[PDB]
Scaffold this active site. Structure first.
Site, short mmCIF file in Angstrom:
data_model
loop_
_atom_site.label_atom_id
_atom_site.label_comp_id
_atom_site.label_asym_id
_atom_site.label_seq_id
_atom_site.Cartn_x
_atom_site.Cartn_y
_atom_site.Cartn_z
N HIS A 91 88.14 156.74 -50.44
CA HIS A 91 88.86 156.21 -51.58
C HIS A 91 88.93 154.70 -51.58
O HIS A 91 89.54 154.12 -52.48
CB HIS A 91 90.29 156.77 -51.62
CG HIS A 91 90.32 158.27 -51.56
ND1 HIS A 91 90.31 158.94 -50.36
CD2 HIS A 91 90.34 159.21 -52.53
CE1 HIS A 91 90.31 160.24 -50.59
NE2 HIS A 91 90.35 160.43 -51.90
N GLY A 92 88.33 154.04 -50.59
CA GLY A 92 88.27 152.60 -50.57
C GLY A 92 89.43 151.93 -49.87
O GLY A 92 90.09 151.06 -50.46
#
Ligand SMILES: CCCCCCCCCCCCCCCCCC(=O)OC[C@H](COP(=O)(O)OCCN)OC(=O)CCCCCCCCCCCCCCCCC
Ligand code: HEC
Ligand code: HEM
Ligand code: HEM
Lengths: 55, 49, 378, 239, 49, 100, 73, 65, 48
Positions: E14-15
């Site tokens: 998800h970064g």
């Protein structure tokens, strides 16, 4: 052409069942013939039957 | 009786005994060169040094 | 008098399939009920053969699946039928929901709620089945969604070490998901029977939304051959998908074995769960993300409580028609953004697409509806 | 860097919607895999009985299996002797352990070639360009333990370029260039990925003839039985 | 490792822009990395628990 | 005022003058609208079920009427609105009597 | 919702229906079907497509801006 | 041995896109030779040249092979 | 580890399982190596 076909195979029901069975078997035979004919006609060359014929 | 049966089934779905058999280790750091990460398996998760 | 109208089974078959009064107007969009039924029994049968050839353990699951797709006769076509039948099952499920939302059939209450419960059940079932092949994507999908269940405070971490079957994705997780994937479609079939029961209580709909009490035609033999036609079209699409491009929809990254150390860069669902994953990673908050997902499907629960129009269909309301097509393009935009990596234009338009989704549903439908109620002097 | 490069679209002989593989090419690729690529990688799920009817005959299958002796169980003594292996063996794994695979290379677990076609983004064209495009970095030196090849996420492979102009010189004339060996090993990896490409295309052809037959005719029956409601007419009489 | 925008740890799911120290800069990560029970023993070893 | 021009264009493009329907043939039916439909004279009620049956026929064939038989906005004989207003007024009066 | 008989109330309405063996299978399937599909297409694309050309513009513009962000280096 | 692949690759870079990519790589070489001891090290030019060159190789190779 | 509460304490069973070699699997180079083994070991197979 059509009138004899309705007079024979479509008045009764048991004759209709008999002709759909016999037609399914004839269609089985001719359809597998046509299917292997087309499939080993568009892949002529690179198929194992001819390579077996090399041996 | 119903809440004890439910408690026993939930405890049947909780864990095992051999899964609770996971404990310490010792890990060596001598091999790693400059600026690089090494991973080690521990409790089903990686372990960075 | 007759065999059919006295026998206790054939009264059920008579009020289902023969003398059910169906409207004489329903278009091709009312075929996806029978298409979901035929897809469901096809999933049950082909999955039953796969379950006859499968060994659920984290050592030998991938080996057994490879044994199916190589050594057992026709296991490759039965496995491809199962996977692409899941894909076509969710195509027909979203077309079924799109029909029921567009033509105002959400004025039904209990059929709609049992519908949404069926949507929850099919999504959970298909996720557990996607965990089952025990590839890299299945391993990390199980891990990340189980931690999504751990996101909630005061309930989460105990619940997630409870359904982990340990402290990570161990043998017990694979066996648990095998058992629940192998039982849940029977519950889906029972709730589909309950769904169909409340429908046959009320009565069906039509593309006009006008009640069709004058022009009911019997189900047999008009709609039976119409559903046979729909089934032949579905089977040819499913079978061309499994015989020409079986990899066109599936993940390439599945086919590696489960290494718990690598974490590949392009982690993603199978394509039907992209928008659920796109609402999640476009909100920089854990509880906010999982709560916004659950609030999306609870917004689908909410939808009967905002029918403040006075027609029934959206056939006759062009403003709400254009807003519904904006909603369709926005959901397809969410699917595309979920099927991408995460960078700056993708971050911005993922956030904007989720915001516009909630703004279209919870605000724009009643504003379009009240302009409709004003504009035709009501 | 993370500037990935998409491999180009190569006109294969199995690229079309009905075309089949070349079994002579599969046989050449298997001779390549026996004499080159089987020293580092593993292809666990390809047994010798898959090779009996597809490319070879059955006799040379027994010959190739009795070239390499593998393993057997106890001889009622617990000593685990050497069996030649008739036909039922899988291919011999070079390294027993993954740690044994790391213990002879620069880390760098060799991936298992049963599914590398179906497991990487881009099909066998990726494997062709990965085997082919060994070139030099402009300015980036990395450690001199690994090699440079641009069709790779991370842009530095740990595999030596294993081809270099006639290391095999196999059965027929067919001189081993880079092109012949790379084409044959890509064809063979596509075969080892999907064992039933040919029978899949056969059933696809039978199915297209099916949906040429049935689709006018089920639709004709539907149009016929619905041709009552498509032409009924109405009139309104009041008293 | 050696990724993100700070020369460190980039979570690809998800970064989560961590770094080689392990502190979040942008993303849905609620906390920083997980610290172990690590104790140095003399030459090259560390007990992990 | 131009809002009447919007209403005329909207009644043109709304799609229910195409199928020969008038204004009150498309009303969604809850309990109140079912009561207001049951409170009708006989001739209007028979004309209503006839227009509804023609609309379902024309949408079954998905054919839309010729130019000379579309319902026009100038002769909009909306009729169901007074009975529906009476149903709403009696329902709200009963609701208020229950509330107090 | 129930069986036939007790649903509605209709006065004098006459319905004619021809036999299916009497009439053709496809009545003028390529002289009315093409104007009907062009009419139903022209009455829907102005309400369906102007969101999808916006989606096409979003896809192309996002592709171009990702290539903008990565093609300078 | 007479290689066909190197023959195709030397004969396919006559096209204008491959020529412009060749000068792009050479000007990046001039750049990092100019701004020497730097951390910007000729990625896009080489990837774009391989992109164009291998696509023209993809167009017109397997006839010969 | 079954004997940890039945007929021994925890330390005594750890001694009784540290008396026996196990032949655990690989290491970094990875042939095999023996191991004392605290609790995760079964009763080891006098004849293989
Ligand atoms: C990719 C999507 C492809 C969609 C293709 C739709 C083609 C048909 C479009 C069309 O013609 O729309 C107008 C039409 C109007 O209705 P009707 O009265 O039947 O038509 C007579 C005059 N047009 O309407 C129709 O014909 C059908 C209107 C749409 C019904 C289906 C909806 C599409 C699927 C929506 C999926 C998302 C729903 C929400 C899911 C939420 C999940 C969290
Ligand atoms: C020993 C020196 C090898 C020989 C001979 C061959 N390969 Fe190899 N290969 C080797 C290693 C150590 C690695 C790993 C490098 C990494 O960083 O992954 C590889 C890798 C591959 C791959 C996968 C690369 C990727 O795209 O991630 C493939 C497809 C591959 N090797 C194929 C291959 C073939 C077809 C070979 C025979 C011609 C071959 N390799 C020889 C080590 C060695
Ligand atoms: C488990 C998957 C589902 C199956 C198998 C299923 C099955 C069916 C069937 C067989 C019908 C009757 C035929 C039809 O009207 O199309 C039907 C009707 C309906 N379903 Fe479902 N359904 C499912 C999921 C849903 C969902 C998720 C919803 C949305 C909440 C939904 C809402 C409806 C509605 C509104 C109708 C009535 C449509 C009408 O009368 O026009 N269904 N369903
Ligand atoms: C009770 C009926 C079902 C049975 C017995 C069943 C059985 C199985 C089995 C054995 C597998 C493992 C084989 C494989 O992974 O290819 C599997 C996988 C799967 N199942 Fe099911 N299943 C059933 C219902 C469903 C349903 C209803 C869906 C959703 C539509 C579904 C979707 C999947 C998916 C997506 C996979 C993964 C396929 C893959 O990646 O190869 N299954 N199922």
């Amino acid at each position: 052409l059509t009138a004899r076909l309705y007079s024979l195979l479509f008045r009764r029901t048991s004759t209709f069942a008999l002709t759909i069975v016999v037609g399914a078997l004839f269609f089985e035979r001719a359809f597998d013939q046509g299917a292997d004919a087309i499939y080993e006609h568009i892949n002529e060359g690179k198929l194992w039957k001819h390579i077996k014929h090399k041996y | 009786a119903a809440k004890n049966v439910v408690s026993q089934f939930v405890s049947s779905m909780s864990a095992s005994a051999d899964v609770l058999a996971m404990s310490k280790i010792e890990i060596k750091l001598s091999d790693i060169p400059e600026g690089k990460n090494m991973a080690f398996k521990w409790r089903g998760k990686p372990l960075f040094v | 008098i007759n065999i059919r109208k006295t026998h206790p089974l054939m009264k059920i078959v008579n009020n289902a399939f023969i003398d059910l009064p169906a409207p004489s107007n329903i278009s091709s969009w009312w075929n996806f009920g029978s298409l979901l039924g035929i897809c469901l029994i096809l999933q049950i049968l082909t999955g039953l053969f796969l379950a006859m050839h499968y060994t659920p353990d984290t050592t030998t699951a991938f080996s057994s699946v490879t044994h199916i797709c190589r050594d057992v006769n026709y296991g490759w076509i039965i496995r491809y039928m199962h996977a692409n039948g899941a894909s076509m099952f969710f195509i027909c499920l979203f077309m079924h929901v799109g029909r029921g939302l567009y033509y105002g059939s959400y004025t039904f209450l209990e059929t709609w709620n049992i519908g949404v419960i069926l949507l929850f059940a099919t999504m959970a079932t298909a996720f557990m089945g996607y965990v089952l092949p025990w590839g890299q994507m299945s391993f990390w999908g199980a891990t990340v969604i189980t931690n999504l269940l751990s996101a909630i405070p005061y309930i989460g971490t105990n619940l997630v070490e409870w359904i982990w079957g340990g402290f990570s994705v161990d043998k017990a997780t694979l066996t648990r998901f095998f058992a629940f994937h192998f039982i849940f479609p029977f519950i889906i079939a029972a709730l589909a029977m309950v769904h169909l029961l409340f429908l046959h209580e009320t009565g069906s709909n039509n593309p006009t939304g006008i009640p069709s009490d004058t022009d009911k035609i019997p189900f047999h033999p008009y709609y039976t051959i119409k559903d046979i036609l729909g089934a032949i079209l579905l089977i040819l699409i499913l079978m061309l998908l499994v015989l020409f491009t079986p990899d066109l929809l599936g993940d390439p990254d599945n086919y590696t074995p489960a290494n718990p150390l690598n974490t590949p860069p392009h982690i993603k669902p199978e394509w039907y769960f992209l928008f659920a994953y796109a609402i999640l990673r476009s909100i920089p908050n854990k509880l906010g993300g999982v709560l916004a997902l659950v609030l999306s499907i609870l917004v689908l629960v909410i939808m009967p409580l905002l029918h403040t129009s006075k027609q029934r269909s959206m056939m006759f309301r062009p403003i709400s028609q254009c807003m519904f097509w904006i909603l369709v393009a926005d959901l397809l935009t969410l699917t595309w953004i979920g099927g991408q990596p995460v960078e700056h234009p993708y971050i911005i338009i993922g956030q904007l697409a989720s915001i516009m989704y909630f703004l279209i549903i919870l605000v724009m439908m009643p504003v379009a509806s009240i302009i409709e109620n004003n504009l035709l002097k009501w | 860097s993370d500037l990935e490069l998409h491999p180009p679209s190569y006109p294969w002989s199995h690229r079309g919607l009905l075309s089949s593989l070349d079994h002579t090419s599969i046989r050449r690729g298997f001779q390549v895999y026996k004499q080159v690529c089987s020293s580092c990688h593993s292809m666990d799920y390809v047994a010798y009985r898959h090779l009996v009817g597809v490319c070879y005959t059955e006799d040379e299958a027994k010959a190739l299996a009795e070239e390499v002796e593998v393993q057997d169980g106890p001889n009622e003594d617990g000593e685990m002797f050497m069996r030649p292996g008739k036909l039922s063996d899988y291919f011999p794994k070079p390294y027993p352990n993954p740690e044994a695979a790391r213990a002879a290379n620069n880390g760098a677990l060799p991936p298992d070639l049963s599914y590398i076609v179906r497991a990487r983004h881009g099909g066998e064209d990726y494997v062709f360009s990965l085997l082919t495009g060994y070139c030099e970095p402009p300015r980036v030196s990395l450690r001199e333990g690994l090699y440079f090849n641009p069709y790779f996420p991370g842009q530095a492979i740990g595999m030596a370029p294993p081809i270099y102009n006639e290391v095999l010189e196999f059965d027929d004339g067919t001189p081993a260039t880079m092109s012949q060996v790379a084409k044959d090993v890509c064809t063979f990896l596509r075969w080892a990925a999907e064992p039933e490409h040919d029978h899949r295309k056969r059933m696809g052809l039978k199915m297209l003839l099916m949906m040429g037959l049935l689709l006018p005719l089920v639709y004709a029956m539907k149009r016929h039985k619905w041709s009552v409601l498509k032409s009924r007419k109405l009139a309104y009489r009041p008293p | 490792a050696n990724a993100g925008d700070f020369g460190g740890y980039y979570c690809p799911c998800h970064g989560s822009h961590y770094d080689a120290s392990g502190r979040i800069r942008k993303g849905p990560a609620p906390l920083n990395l997980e610290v172990p029970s690590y104790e140095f023993t003399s030459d090259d070893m560390v007990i992990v628990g | 005022k131009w809002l009447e021009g919007i209403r005329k264009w909207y009644y043109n493009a709304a799609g229910f003058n195409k199928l020969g329907l008038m204004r009150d043939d498309t009303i969604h039916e809850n309990d109140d609208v079912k009561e207001a439909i049951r409170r009708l004279p006989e001739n209007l009620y028979n004309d209503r079920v006839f227009r509804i049956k023609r609309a379902l026929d024309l949408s079954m064939r998905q054919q839309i009427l010729p130019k000379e038989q579309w319902t026009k906005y100038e002769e909009d004989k909306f009729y169901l609105e007074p009975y529906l207003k009476e149903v709403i007024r009696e329902r709200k009066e009963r609701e208020e009597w229950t509330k107090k | 919702g129930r069986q036939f008989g007790h649903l509605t109330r209709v006065r004098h309405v006459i319905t004619y229906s021809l036999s299916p063996f009497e009439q053709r299978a496809f009545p003028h399937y390529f002289s009315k079907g093409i104007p009907n599909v062009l009419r139903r297409t022209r009455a829907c694309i102005l309400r369906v497509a102007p969101p999808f050309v916006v989606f096409y513009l979003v896809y192309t513009w996002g592709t171009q801006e990702f290539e903008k962000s990565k093609r300078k280096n | 041995l007479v290689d066909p692949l190197t023959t195709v690759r030397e004969q396919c870079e006559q096209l204008e896109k491959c020529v412009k990519a060749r000068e792009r790589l050479e000007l990046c070489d001039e750049r990092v030779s100019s701004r020497s001891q730097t951390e910007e090290d000729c990625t896009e030019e080489l990837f774009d040249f391989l992109h164009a060159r291998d696509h023209c190789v993809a167009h017109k190779l397997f006839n010969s092979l």
